[PDB]
Amino acid sequence: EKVEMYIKNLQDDSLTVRINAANALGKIGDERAVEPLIKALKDEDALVRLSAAWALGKIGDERAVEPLIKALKDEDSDVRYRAATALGQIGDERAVEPLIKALKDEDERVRQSAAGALGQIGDERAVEPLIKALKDEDWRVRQEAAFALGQIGDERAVEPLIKALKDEDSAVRWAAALALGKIGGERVRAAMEKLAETGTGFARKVAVNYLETHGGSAGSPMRCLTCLKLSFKPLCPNCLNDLPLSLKVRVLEGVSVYSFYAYSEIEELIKSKYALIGSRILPLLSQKAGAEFVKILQEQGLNIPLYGIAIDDKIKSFYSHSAALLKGFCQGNLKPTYGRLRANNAVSYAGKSLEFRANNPRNFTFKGDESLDYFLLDDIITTGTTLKEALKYLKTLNIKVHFAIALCSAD
Amino acid sequence: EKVEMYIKNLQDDSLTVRINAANALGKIGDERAVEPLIKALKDEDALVRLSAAWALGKIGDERAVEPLIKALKDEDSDVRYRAATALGQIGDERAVEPLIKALKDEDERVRQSAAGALGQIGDERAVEPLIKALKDEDWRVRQEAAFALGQIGDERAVEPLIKALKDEDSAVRWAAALALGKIGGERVRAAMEKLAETGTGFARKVAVNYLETHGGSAGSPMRCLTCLKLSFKPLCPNCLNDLPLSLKVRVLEGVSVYSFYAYSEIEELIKSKYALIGSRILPLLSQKAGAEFVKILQEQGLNIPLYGIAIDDKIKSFYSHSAALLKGFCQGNLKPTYGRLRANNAVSYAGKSLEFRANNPRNFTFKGDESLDYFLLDDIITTGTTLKEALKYLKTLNIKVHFAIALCSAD
Ligand SMILES: O=P(O)(O)OC[C@H]1O[C@H](OP(=O)(O)OP(=O)(O)O)[C@H](O)[C@@H]1O
Ligand SMILES: O=P(O)(O)OC[C@H]1O[C@H](OP(=O)(O)OP(=O)(O)O)[C@H](O)[C@@H]1O
Ligand SMILES: [Mg+2]
Ligand SMILES: [Mg+2]
Ligand SMILES: [Mg+2]
Ligand SMILES: [Mg+2]
Ligand SMILES: [Zn+2]
Ligand SMILES: [Zn+2]
């Protein structure tokens, strides 16, 4: 590195060489450049003074705090702006009182950068002056003071920030709503409830999102089961989107079988198929799967009306589980049919060997129109025994089965 | 409707007619079918008894509560299961004590359906018996008791549910973690902190998501600026994904100009370009835009290395705003270049008429290799004055400008 070369270039006669040396020492900043840059703050030209101030904040050494405090009283508003920004970047408590005075500066950029620096330092002494800054003539200063109050997290700012939600500027209302959510509490919850209902823009977005996780509280309010956010469906769209959809194809009895999820990735959701609460989760997964499958059929060219057959469930389930899973999957040219195929025995293959499954068949029975174009759907495929049996049985009845869907794959 | 026809079919001699009448009255359920269905609960066949019980819960009339309580002591476990489910669907407090006894049933399905019904009713009296049910031999009963305790929301269940996070079944741990998050509090926050760090599966997912919004609390912890969730980037991927990306194309000086967002949809994020906190939001938006644009170039066939030129920013910004916006956009065959194009005046067109803009030009200056394949990038297009001027200037210098990018559109 050339750190020591740039340190020498700070005392050059050429202005463009002195400036480039200060900017270079801001990127490749070493503690060796701190003392030479402190001297560069007393340069004749303001372009060198502001570049040295910028570089000192980028280095972050506590030695530059006192000369940067003197640079807050500089004749040039660009040098004052850089000194205020740098003081917050360093984060030393000594800059708090000098930065509080900079909040009353003539230049709106110096006021704004001093407010942001006070939030970066996080000292409680800045709370009252930043509350006054929420009534500045420049909206950029108001916005920066609201953001700084949220970074400090002092409750003394709650009522002034609630009044800032009625500001004329959209970015100021947004900064105030954010600051409120960062502080939290009962007065904030009540302000968010009014802002979500009557507010607009990004301020309303913050309020709506805050109430999804904090508000709406009740013993039994409908919530998402993977993130606990308030949601009418047991899986919010964000959580549903995060579920890994892995498409696989196997050929069983000449019929193509499509799976959409791996058992290892949705194990708990599958295990909860006979739970009261975790029941309505599977129709959400099959709706996601059916939407991708309908695109596959269009790419294939299979645009004929198709009729779904589900393996009829027994009294061991809370509701018509297969009917709900099939109703969710069906969309586009897919249409659901109920009670066409049923097993004469209620044996469970879960956790059983391939030998047990092959020796315990479900005696299938078909009851419906045989001239229709069908497809069968089931929740999971482990060994393919159940599907091979259903396909073989319907093939003997001369029934058109275009494909089979097994939502989840364990094979 | 045929409600009164099905009411008569309940007293038919044919078994298949009596069953279909009870099932039909469960879908097209009227209060007129309640008294006939109460009589159908005392049928000789269990298939009629369970269908009448199912239909009574679907109707939800309080008159069926007492005969369904008697149906909890039925000889058939399928009729008991249906009576327990229906009692929770109605939600009458009178079923609480009879359902508490059903938690000790021989059939694991009756115990499970009674636990879920107790959670639907929401009465506090079920808390202690449901806590005992968290130690059932059947994991489906344990899972249902954990879900029911979360629906009641009584704090007496916190410590037994914290012990359920160490259950041998994955769905039971998941149900217990959900129930804890639904109750909330300091003991829950501490249990979520250990579960997020040391747990696995969906139980860990719930814990991680709960801590993103409730935990990690500090005065200045890095948070998302649209949902307040803990996030190192000022916009979490979920919030970034929700931002409406609207691609538009205009031709300025023969050069195609691409925009990716509407000003009306990201107004506050654009307005905050010169704010300290809201600064790093725009490079996130241009990274999202550049990822879609790189797919457009591949579809077009423009696979040549392209070099980005940004309109150089002045001392009015916190950092190199254009450099950060260009660095975020560039990916794939797009490579960034800095300080090649600069305006000799710092006039601001924001909120000015088309007349003001056309009479106040930015005297552009190019400094770089002219033989390169370039593209220019800017944050917003309102009237196209700035872009028409930059393109016209570079065209006179015989410089290859393949296209222009204006992240945001106000035109
Ligand atoms: O590919 P396979 O080896 O045939 O296994 C798949 C079958 O296993 C499950 O049924 P199960 O018999 O366990 O019924 P259940 O719904 O009563 O648990 C599942 O619902 C499928 O029907
Ligand atoms: O399409 P147009 O009509 O030319 O307007 C677009 C220009 O307006 C803004 O610049 P501005 O002059 O406001 O600079 P600023 O960043 O200092 O506010 C923006 O950054 C573009 O340069
Ligand atoms: Mg099954
Ligand atoms: Mg559907
Ligand atoms: Mg500009
Ligand atoms: Mg990038
Ligand atoms: Zn969710
Ligand atoms: Zn977010």
Author numbering:
A (entry chain A), B (entry chain C): 16 to 426
Study authors write:
The ComFC protein is essential for natural transformation, a process that plays a major role in the spread of antibiotic resistance genes and virulence factors across bacteria. The crystal structure of ComFC includes a zinc-finger motif and a putative phosphoribosyl transferase domain, both necessary for the protein’s in vivo activity. Furthermore, we show that ComFC is a membrane-associated protein with affinity for single-stranded DNA.
Thus, in order to help crystallisation, we generated a gene fusion between the full-length comFC gene and an artificial αRep binder coding sequence selected from a highly diverse library of artificial repeat proteins based on thermostable HEAT-like repeats. Diffracting crystals were however obtained with the purified fusion protein in the presence of PRPP and the 3D structure of full-length ComFC in complex with PRPP was solved at 2.5 Å resolution. The fusion (αRep: residues 1–229, linker: residues 230–236, ComFC: residues 237–427) is present in four copies in the asymmetric unit, organised in two domain-swapped dimers: the αRep of one fusion covers the ComFC of the other one. The “PRPP loop” carries the canonical 157DDIITTGTTL166 active site signature allowing the binding of the ribose-5-phosphate group of the PRPP. The most variable “PPi loop” (A89 to H100) allowing the binding of the PPi group of the PRPP is slightly longer than the standard four amino acids loops. The “flexible loop” (L120 to T144) closes the pocket of the binding site occupied in our structure by the PRPP (red sticks in Fig. 5c, e).
